């Protein structure tokens, strides 16, 4: 595996951003986290991150045990929390060669317990032979907008970091007609010293 994706489904872009109210005068958006996929990756053993996500019934080890292991990835984000009352959004684009309908479940876990879940469905859209699946500008759920504001306030980066130590997200992309899991992505978090912007690192999850 050489990127965040498998032979059926590839992630083209993902980001979480905020556009300030000024955006409609002169445009700007701040990116908290951004993957852009316009040697093989490193491994991380899935057993390491079991206790960071729910247990079974929608949890990592029940999923990884139903395979396929090449579908599972870990993304460590370094979030840029340096940027009230604007638009907070999330944007996902995937690409395949097969025509499919997709269900994208994203579960937000605090201390390894689902706190908020969103489930969307995106039908494929033919383009240059490939199919594009576009879930652009989904409004960020108000738990995360609140959470981010709270995190912005903490007095020290190392406190944000230990708070974020217990904050993970699990995205599960499944073929809605088949139920075949196509992509599973666990997200762990730290903050970035915002001269450096958002950064990230993508691993394969193995055993
Ligand atoms: O409404 C669902 C939103 C969503 C699904 N999957 C995601 C993956 C990342 C992410 O960024 C938020 C974040 C940035 C910095 C620190 C903590 C959280 C948001 C989402």
């Amino acid at each position: 595996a050489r990127g965040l994706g498998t032979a059926r489904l590839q992630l083209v872009e993902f980001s979480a951003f905020v556009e300030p109210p000024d955006a409609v005068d002169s445009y700007q958006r701040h990116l908290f986290v951004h993957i852009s996929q316009h040697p093989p990756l490193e491994s991380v053993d899935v057993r390491q991150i079991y206790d960071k996500f729910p247990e079974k019934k929608g949890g990592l080890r029940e999923l990884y045990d139903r395979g396929p292991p090449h579908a599972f990835f870990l993304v460590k984000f370094w979030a840029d929390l340096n940027w009230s009352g604007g638009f907070y959004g999330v944007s996902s684009q995937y690409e395949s060669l097969e025509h499919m309908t997709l269900t994208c479940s994203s579960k937000v876990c605090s201390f390894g317990k689902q706190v908020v879940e969103k489930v969307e469905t995106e039908r494929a859209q033919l383009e240059d032979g490939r199919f594009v699946y576009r879930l652009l500008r989904s409004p960020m759920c108000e738990y995360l907008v609140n959470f981010l504001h709270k995190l912005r306030q903490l007095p020290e980066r190392y406190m944000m970091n230990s708070v974020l130590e217990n904050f993970t997200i699990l995205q599960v992309v499944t073929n809605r007609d088949t139920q075949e899991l196509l992509l599973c992505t666990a997200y762990v978090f730290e903050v970035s010293t915002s001269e450096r912007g958002a950064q990230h690192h993508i691993y394969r999850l193995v055993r």
Side-chain angles (χ1 to χ4, degrees), residues 1-55 58-207:
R2 307 203 148 188
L4 181 42
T6 85
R8 298 179 76 164
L9 194 69
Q10 168 123 51
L11 184 119
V12 175
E13 253 201 287
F14 165 92
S15 63
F17 59 88
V18 56
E19 303 160 335
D22 294 68
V24 319
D25 278 19
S26 208
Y27 182 66
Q28 49 188 304
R29 75 153 74 160
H30 171 84
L31 290 158
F32 303 107
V33 293
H34 184 249
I35 315 188
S36 176
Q37 310 193 115
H38 290 269
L41 309 156
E42 296 191 41
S43 324
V44 172
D45 176 290
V46 49
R47 308 175 225 257
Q48 270 198 20
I49 59 199
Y50 285 161
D51 57 5
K52 322 198 73 73
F53 300 78
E55 279 273 2
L60 196 45
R61 69 172 88 209
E62 223 43 31
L63 282 160
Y64 192 95
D65 261 307
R66 302 191 328 256
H70 72 294
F72 295 77
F73 293 87
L74 162 61
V75 182
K76 155 86 82 83
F77 279 136
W78 284 272
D80 180 340
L81 294 68
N82 205 268
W83 78 99
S84 241
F87 173 79
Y88 293 71
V90 181
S91 292
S92 305
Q93 185 166 317
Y94 306 90
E95 290 200 11
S96 77
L97 267 146
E98 342 193 7
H99 181 106
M100 280 164 329
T101 326
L102 295 192
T103 308
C104 328
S105 169
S106 35
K107 311 167 130 213
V108 178
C109 310
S110 160
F111 291 85
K113 71 111 147 186
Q114 187 185 114
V115 154
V116 295
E117 167 177 33
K118 308 280 182 136
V119 197
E120 292 148 322
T121 322
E122 189 59 28
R123 221 195 226 161
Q125 273 188 244
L126 209 165
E127 291 235 327
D128 203 30
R130 278 241 194 209
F131 290 135
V132 190
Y133 308 75
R134 290 199 244 260
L135 316 84
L136 305 178
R137 303 179 65 71
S138 327
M140 202 170 26
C141 47
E142 257 165 15
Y143 172 94
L144 276 170
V145 184
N146 286 346
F147 175 65
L148 284 163
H149 270 303
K150 280 156 192 171
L151 214 50
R152 195 161 191 219
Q153 262 148 46
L154 302 192
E156 299 278 351
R157 271 194 47 253
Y158 84 80
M159 297 171 182
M160 308 170 165
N161 271 343
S162 52
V163 175
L164 293 168
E165 203 186 283
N166 297 127
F167 175 87
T168 69
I169 278 152
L170 189 75
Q171 282 198 303
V172 182
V173 185
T174 89
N175 186 323
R176 178 241 199 150
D177 303 318
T178 278
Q179 310 304 55
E180 271 154 341
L181 190 138
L182 299 169
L183 211 57
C184 181
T185 296
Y187 298 96
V188 302
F189 293 89
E190 289 180 43
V191 291
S192 162
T193 88
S194 293
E195 322 166 88
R196 327 187 59 167
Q199 211 158 13
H200 62 77
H201 202 310
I202 298 172
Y203 307 76
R204 312 179 228 89
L205 274 182
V206 291
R207 209 175 29 53

